[PDB]
């Protein structure tokens, strides 16, 4: 959780909407969005 201590990462996934400090991190993350289709309780 976050309230107001640090800033906000520039890169932000589009599939789920996550955030990443470094681009590379995202490029690799986006991959995870290549199967998970079924529902998920949070």
Closest CB to Zn ion among 5 and 14?
14
Shortest reach from residue 21's CB to Zn ion, in Å:
15
Residues 21 and 35: their CA atoms lie apart, in Å, by 24
The contact set with Zn ion (CB under 5 A) reads 13, 15-16, 18
CB distance 11 to 22 below 8 Å? yes
Shortest reach from residue 26's CB to Zn ion, in Å:
8
Shortest reach from residue 29's CB to Zn ion, in Å:
6
Closest to 21 (Cα-Cα) out of 29, 12, 30, 31 = 12
């Amino acid at each position: 959780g976050s309230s107001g201590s640090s800033g906000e990462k520039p890169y932000v996934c589009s599939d789920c909407g996550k955030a990443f400090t470094f681009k590379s991190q995202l490029i690799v993350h986006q991959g995870i969005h290549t199967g998970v289709s079924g529902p998920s309780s949070g």
